[PDB]
Each structure stands twice: as C-alpha cells, then as structure tokens.
C-alpha cells in the first residue's frame, strides 16, 4: 500500500515549502492531504498565494495516522502551528507513535512550541536558529536537510527539492526518489 | 516605481512553476497579478494543489500593460494557454510592445501555439523539446535558463529559482536579485 503525508498548512505558511513538498511527494506515489489549520477555507499565504486546502485538520486528523507529518515554515506561518493545541496533539501522538516528523525554514520552531523531538540535531533558517535554540534543547546543524531518526528538518525555500526527496527517501526509499528526482531538471 | 508580471494559470499547470515565480517576483518587490484562464475560479494545478487566482485573466487585461507575462509548465496547462484565443492576443500585444515575455518546461510550447518569438534560442523540458521544435522556428539550447532578448524560458521544476531569479535582474536588476537570492538558502 501507499504511504501517507499529512501537510498542515496556516495563514502566513511560505507558499514555496507548502506546493514543493506535496508536488514532489504526489509524484513519489504517496496520498498527501493538504489540512487546513483553521478550517476548510483558502489559506493566503506569506506571499500572498492562496491555497485551498483538501480538508480542516479536524477531519484529516480522523483519517490518520500518516506515514510523515509534514510543517511548512514562514514565520506567521510556524507561529499559527506553534499556538495551535490541535497541532500538539497531532505531533505528540505522531512522536508516540514513533512517526517521521519533517518540518522546514521557521517550522521546526513549532518542533521547539510542542516539546517535540529535544534532543534531536536540526536545522532550521539561518534567521530561526536563536528562537529554535532557547533553551538548548536541540544541537544545531548548517546541513541543508539534517534527519536525526524520526526528526527531518531544512532550512529554507532553496533547500524545499532537498526536504522533499530526504521525505520521499525515507517512505519510499532511493530507488524512487531518483526516480522522482530525474524529471525535475535539479542541479 | 514598480514593475509588473502577469502569471497565466489554466487548469493542469505545474504549481511549483506557477509559485516559485510569483512568491520570488513579490520578494523582489514585483507587482504580480495571478490570473486565471478559466475565469476567478480556484485552479486545479498538475499535482491537485488548488490556487485561488488574484483575477480573472479578462479583467487583469483590462488592467495591463504588464512589464513581464509569465507561463508556467505543466503539459495540460500549456495545452490549454495554447489553445486559447485570449493568451494569443495578451501575448501578440506583449510582443508588439517588446515586452518580456518568459515560458518555462511546456510553458514555451504556447508560444509556438501563438508563433510568438519565431527566430528566438529556446529551452524547455527535455521530454517537450520535440514539440517545440515541430519546424525549426526556433534554436534549441539546453541552458537551465534560455534568455535571447525579450523571450525568456527554463526547463523544469528544479530550475524555477533560476527562472524567476532571471526575471526579477532583467526587470529590477542584478543588484535586487541577488538580495532577494540569499534569503532563500540556494545552493
């Protein structure tokens, strides 16, 4: 069977880091469901694209659990799914569970929100690294994409292709994330 | 003042190449209007992503004339730009005016659609450059941005940063767009 992706997307979420992972996972063979924070309504995001979600993340949450958790960033974006009491209990179950968590750019620091994953090596923006690291509770990294076990981070929209193929790898393997990866014209 | 881009968006369009451009050409300070071929309805994009266009491609005419028109890939959203009677007008015009005009993967078999450019060096996706070249009536080059005057094209979803990078200098300058670059952590 087919795996399973779960992006939460929140008014203010970088638009990049929402479409190029749930492109990019779509052609991997994964069903991916596009859940609204606040509902079903479009979601305008950090650059003003409008997107209109696949479900409320009450509904998506009842058609669970996912294979990868997936948190874009933009800061108004991380900081909707930080203050969100629906999105802890999404990623502590997922945590519990002992799910892949991928989040990228300013998301980790909704990781840093939820007690989620300390421990653990991120990275995260450049602009990110001191609110992700109050307090110590993570060791940082310059990696472009770092995966420590079950905690996937990345840093920023150039590093998106990056995120996405390290998501793909790790539910679907190598094979098919070059597989994925040709028609895409990366460098 | 400020430039201003007009991005096409016709059902089954690739929505990285549809974002990526829009999100970099507003970091650049770019006025973009998203408009939509169909009307104001959301749009069905390649991937199942949905995006709310600003406009109706009808009226955003209305309020034109645009410094840049922009067409995402995607095969069925380059057929339907192809097809349509509207995009050959908006694009005869720009071309009359000797304004840009940029097409990325299928996106530049629209222009062959429209014999828009005839004469010009072209890239486009590898899997579409037969299309193209049905003719002869342009170069084929295999560059990861293509720009021979005022024609502007790319090759695919992993050189969408590059295209909309190449933009942003040619309305803006050099200047703006390596200040929009570093933010976005590229390699």
Same mark, same amino acid.
Request: glycine share 10%.
């Given at each position: ?9 929140? !008014? ?18 994964? !069903? ?38 997936? =948190? ?27 799910? =892949? ?12 929100? &939820? ?9 995260? &923006? ?10 110590? &509770? ?50």
């Amino acid at each position: 069977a087919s795996k399973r992706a779960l992006v939460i997307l929140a !008014k203010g979420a970088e638009e990049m880091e929402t479409v190029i992972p749930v492109d990019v996972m779509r052609r991997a063979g994964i !069903k991916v469901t596009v859940a609204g924070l606040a509902g079903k309504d479009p979601v305008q995001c950090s650059r003003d694209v409008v997107i209109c979600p696949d479900a409320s993340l009450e509904d998506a949450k009842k058609e669970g659990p996912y294979d990868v958790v997936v =948190l874009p960033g933009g800061n108004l974006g991380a900081q909707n799914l930080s203050e969100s009491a629906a999105v802890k209990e999404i990623l502590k179950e997922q945590e519990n569970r002992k799910g =892949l968590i991928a989040a990228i750019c300013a998301g980790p620091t909704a990781l840093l929100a &939820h007690e989620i994953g300390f421990g653990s090596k991120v990275t995260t &923006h450049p602009l990110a690294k001191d609110k992700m690291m109050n307090g110590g &509770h993570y060791t940082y990294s310059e990696n472009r994409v770092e995966k420590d076990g079950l905690i996937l981070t990345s840093r920023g929209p150039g590093t998106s292709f990056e995120f996405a193929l390290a998501i793909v790898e790790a539910l679907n393997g190598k094979e098919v994330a070059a597989q994925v990866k040709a028609p895409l014209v990366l460098k």
